Short mmCIF file of C-alpha atoms and ligand atoms in Angstrom, two decimals:
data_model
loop_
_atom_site.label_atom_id
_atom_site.label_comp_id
_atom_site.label_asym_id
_atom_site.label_seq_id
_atom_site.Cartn_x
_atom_site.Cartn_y
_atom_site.Cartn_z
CA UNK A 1 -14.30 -29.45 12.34
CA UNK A 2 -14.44 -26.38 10.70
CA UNK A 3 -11.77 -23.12 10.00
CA UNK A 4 -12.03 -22.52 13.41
CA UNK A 5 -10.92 -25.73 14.68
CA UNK A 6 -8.77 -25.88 12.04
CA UNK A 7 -6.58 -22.67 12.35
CA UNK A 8 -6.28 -23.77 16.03
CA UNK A 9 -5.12 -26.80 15.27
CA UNK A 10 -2.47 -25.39 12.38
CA UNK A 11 -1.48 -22.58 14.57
CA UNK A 12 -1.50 -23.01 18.19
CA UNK A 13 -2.41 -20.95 21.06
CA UNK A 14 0.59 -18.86 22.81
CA UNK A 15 -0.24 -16.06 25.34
CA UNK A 16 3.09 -14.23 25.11
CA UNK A 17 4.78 -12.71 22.08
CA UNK A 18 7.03 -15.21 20.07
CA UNK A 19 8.27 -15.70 16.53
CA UNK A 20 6.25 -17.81 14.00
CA UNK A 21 8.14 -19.84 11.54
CA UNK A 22 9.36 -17.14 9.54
CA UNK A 23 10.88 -15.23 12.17
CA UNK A 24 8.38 -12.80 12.62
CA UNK A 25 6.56 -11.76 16.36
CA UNK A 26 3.64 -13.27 16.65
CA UNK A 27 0.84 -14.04 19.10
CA UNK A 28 -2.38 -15.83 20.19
CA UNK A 29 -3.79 -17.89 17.49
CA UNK A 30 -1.08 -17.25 14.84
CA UNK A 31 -1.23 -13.31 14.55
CA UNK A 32 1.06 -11.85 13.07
CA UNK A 33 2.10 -8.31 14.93
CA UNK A 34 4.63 -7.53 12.18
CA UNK A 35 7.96 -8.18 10.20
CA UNK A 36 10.23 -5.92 12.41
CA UNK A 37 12.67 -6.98 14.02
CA UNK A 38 11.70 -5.04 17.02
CA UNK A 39 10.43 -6.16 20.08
CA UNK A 40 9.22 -2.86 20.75
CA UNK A 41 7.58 -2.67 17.83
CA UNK A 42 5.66 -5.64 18.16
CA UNK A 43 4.38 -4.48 21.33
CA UNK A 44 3.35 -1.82 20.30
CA UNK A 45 1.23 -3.79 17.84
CA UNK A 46 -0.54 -5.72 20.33
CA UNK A 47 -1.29 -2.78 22.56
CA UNK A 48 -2.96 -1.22 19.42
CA UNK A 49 -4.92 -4.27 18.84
CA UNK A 50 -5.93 -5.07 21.96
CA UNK A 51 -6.59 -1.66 23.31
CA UNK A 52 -4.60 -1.62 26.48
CA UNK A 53 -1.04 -1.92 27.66
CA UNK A 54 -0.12 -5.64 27.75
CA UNK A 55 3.22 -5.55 28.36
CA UNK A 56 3.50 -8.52 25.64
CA UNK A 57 1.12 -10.98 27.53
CA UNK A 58 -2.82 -11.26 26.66
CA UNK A 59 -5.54 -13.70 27.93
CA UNK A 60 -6.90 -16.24 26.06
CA UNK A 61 -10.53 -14.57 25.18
CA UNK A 62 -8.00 -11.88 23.75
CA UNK A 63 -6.67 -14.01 21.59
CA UNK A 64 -9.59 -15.56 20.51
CA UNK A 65 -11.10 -12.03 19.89
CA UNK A 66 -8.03 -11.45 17.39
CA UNK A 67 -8.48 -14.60 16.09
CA UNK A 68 -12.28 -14.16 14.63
CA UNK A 69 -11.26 -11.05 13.74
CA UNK A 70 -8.51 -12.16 11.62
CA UNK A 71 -10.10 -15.65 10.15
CA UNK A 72 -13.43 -12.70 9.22
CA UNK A 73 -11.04 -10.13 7.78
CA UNK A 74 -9.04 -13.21 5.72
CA UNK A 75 -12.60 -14.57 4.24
CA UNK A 76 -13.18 -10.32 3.32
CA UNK A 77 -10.09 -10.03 1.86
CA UNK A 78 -10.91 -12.95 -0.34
CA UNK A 79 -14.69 -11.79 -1.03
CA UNK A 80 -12.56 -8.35 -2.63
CA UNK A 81 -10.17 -10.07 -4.31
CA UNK A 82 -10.92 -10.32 -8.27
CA UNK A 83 -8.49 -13.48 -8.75
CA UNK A 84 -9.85 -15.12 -5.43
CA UNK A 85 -13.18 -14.86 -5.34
CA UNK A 86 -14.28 -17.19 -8.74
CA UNK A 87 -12.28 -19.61 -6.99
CA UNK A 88 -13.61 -19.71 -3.75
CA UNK A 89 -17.22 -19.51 -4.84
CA UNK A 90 -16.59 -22.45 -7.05
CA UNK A 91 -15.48 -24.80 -4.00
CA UNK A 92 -17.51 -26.52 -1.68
CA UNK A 93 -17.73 -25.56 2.30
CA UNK A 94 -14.79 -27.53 3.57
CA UNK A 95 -12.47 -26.67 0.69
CA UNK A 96 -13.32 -23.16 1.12
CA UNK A 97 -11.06 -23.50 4.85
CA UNK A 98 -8.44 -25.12 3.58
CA UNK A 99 -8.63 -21.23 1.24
CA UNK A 100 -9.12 -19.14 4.21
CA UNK A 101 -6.14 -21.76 6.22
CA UNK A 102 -3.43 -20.36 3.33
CA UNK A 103 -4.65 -17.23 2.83
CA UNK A 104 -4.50 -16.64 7.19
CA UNK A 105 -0.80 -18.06 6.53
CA UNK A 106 0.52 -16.58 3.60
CA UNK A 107 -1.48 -13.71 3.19
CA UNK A 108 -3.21 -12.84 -0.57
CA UNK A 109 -0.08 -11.78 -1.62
CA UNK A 110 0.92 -14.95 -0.64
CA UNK A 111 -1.58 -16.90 -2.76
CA UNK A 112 -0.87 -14.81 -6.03
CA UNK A 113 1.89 -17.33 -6.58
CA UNK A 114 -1.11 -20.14 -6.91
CA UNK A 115 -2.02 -19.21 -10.19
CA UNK A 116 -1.65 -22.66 -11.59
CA UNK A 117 -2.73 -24.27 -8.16
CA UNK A 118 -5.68 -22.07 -8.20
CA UNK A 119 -6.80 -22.92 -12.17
CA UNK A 120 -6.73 -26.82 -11.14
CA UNK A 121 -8.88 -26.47 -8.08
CA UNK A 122 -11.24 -23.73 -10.28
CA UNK A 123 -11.55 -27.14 -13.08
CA UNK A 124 -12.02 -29.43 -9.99
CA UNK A 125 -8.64 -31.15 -11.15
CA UNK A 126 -8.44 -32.21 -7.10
CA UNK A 127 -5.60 -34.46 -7.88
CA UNK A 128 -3.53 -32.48 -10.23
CA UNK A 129 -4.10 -29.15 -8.09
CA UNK A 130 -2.25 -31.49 -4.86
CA UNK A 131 0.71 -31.93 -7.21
CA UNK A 132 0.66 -28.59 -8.49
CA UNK A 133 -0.17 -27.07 -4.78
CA UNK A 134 2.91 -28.86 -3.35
CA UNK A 135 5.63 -27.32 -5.64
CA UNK A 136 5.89 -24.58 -3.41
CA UNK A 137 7.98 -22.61 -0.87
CA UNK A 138 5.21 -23.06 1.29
CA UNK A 139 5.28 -26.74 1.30
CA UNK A 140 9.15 -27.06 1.59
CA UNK A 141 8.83 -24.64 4.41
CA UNK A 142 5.76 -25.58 5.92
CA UNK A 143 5.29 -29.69 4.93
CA UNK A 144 3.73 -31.18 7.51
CA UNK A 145 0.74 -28.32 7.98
CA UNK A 146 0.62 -28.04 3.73
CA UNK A 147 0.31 -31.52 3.48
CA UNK A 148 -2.99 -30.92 5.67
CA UNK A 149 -4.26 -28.21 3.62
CA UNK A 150 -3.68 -30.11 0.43
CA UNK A 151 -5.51 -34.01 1.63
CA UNK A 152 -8.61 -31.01 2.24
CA UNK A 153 -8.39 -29.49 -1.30
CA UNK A 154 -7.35 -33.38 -2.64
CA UNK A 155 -10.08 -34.71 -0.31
CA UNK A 156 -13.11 -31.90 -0.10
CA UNK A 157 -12.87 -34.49 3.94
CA UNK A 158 -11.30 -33.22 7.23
CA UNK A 159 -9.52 -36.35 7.19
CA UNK A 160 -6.14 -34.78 7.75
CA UNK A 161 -7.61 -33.50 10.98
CA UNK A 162 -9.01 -36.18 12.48
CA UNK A 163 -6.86 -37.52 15.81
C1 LIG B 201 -9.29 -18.26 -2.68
C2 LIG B 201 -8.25 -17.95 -1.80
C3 LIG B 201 -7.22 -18.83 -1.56
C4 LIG B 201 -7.24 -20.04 -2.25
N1 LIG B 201 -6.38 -21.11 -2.21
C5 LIG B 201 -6.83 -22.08 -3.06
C6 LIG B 201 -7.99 -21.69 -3.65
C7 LIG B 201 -8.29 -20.38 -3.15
C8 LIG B 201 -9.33 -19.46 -3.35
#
């Protein structure tokens, strides 16, 4: 186990455009093409970031090539980020995916909310940070793959992915 496996396992692996849980188009390993509602404009998306005219369908070493890009880009964007990066550096190696697993869902704009959250975890608080962590949008909307992410932060074990 590691982010890898783990974004696989949270996300899937589709080879045609469709909509992630929020509606949006999406493809491959979870990536997000954007928040239009056109289909057009999705594919448009993917041609740009594949480099080719798909006509909405890519092969699965595409997707895979989006998908290091995007779990690399997520751990940069983190790196950059004046809020995120004390945390991060303060966690250990497999609570540091379970950070790169939200931020790849929710974006950092996303994980601004998780103030609080983000404190507990900082103070090693593993148990109060769950509670905290689960009063959330994100876990009403997502439970069964937040629950996941917060036995890792709870845990510091992949036992939530084990199977
Ligand atoms: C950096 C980015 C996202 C995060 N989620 C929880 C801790 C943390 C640190």
């Amino acid at each position: 186990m590691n982010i890898f496996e783990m974004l696989r396992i949270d996300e899937g692996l589709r080879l045609k455009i469709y909509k992630n849980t929020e509606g949006y188009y999406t493809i491959g390993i979870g990536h997000l093409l954007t928040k239009s509602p056109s289909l057009n404009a999705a594919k448009s998306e993917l041609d740009k970031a594949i480099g080719r005219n798909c006509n909405g369908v890519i092969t699965k070493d595409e997707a895979e090539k989006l998908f290091n890009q995007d779990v690399d880009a997520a751990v940069r964007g983190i790196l950059r980020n004046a809020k995120l990066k004390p945390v991060y550096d303060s966690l250990d190696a497999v609570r540091r995916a379970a950070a790169i697993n939200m931020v790849f869902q929710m974006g950092e704009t996303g994980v601004a909310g998780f103030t609080n959250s983000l404190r507990m975890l900082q103070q090693k608080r593993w148990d109060e940070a769950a509670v905290n962590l689960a009063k959330s949008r994100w876990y009403n909307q997502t439970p069964n793959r937040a629950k996941r992410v917060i036995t890792t932060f709870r845990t510091g074990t992949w036992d939530a992915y084990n199977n």
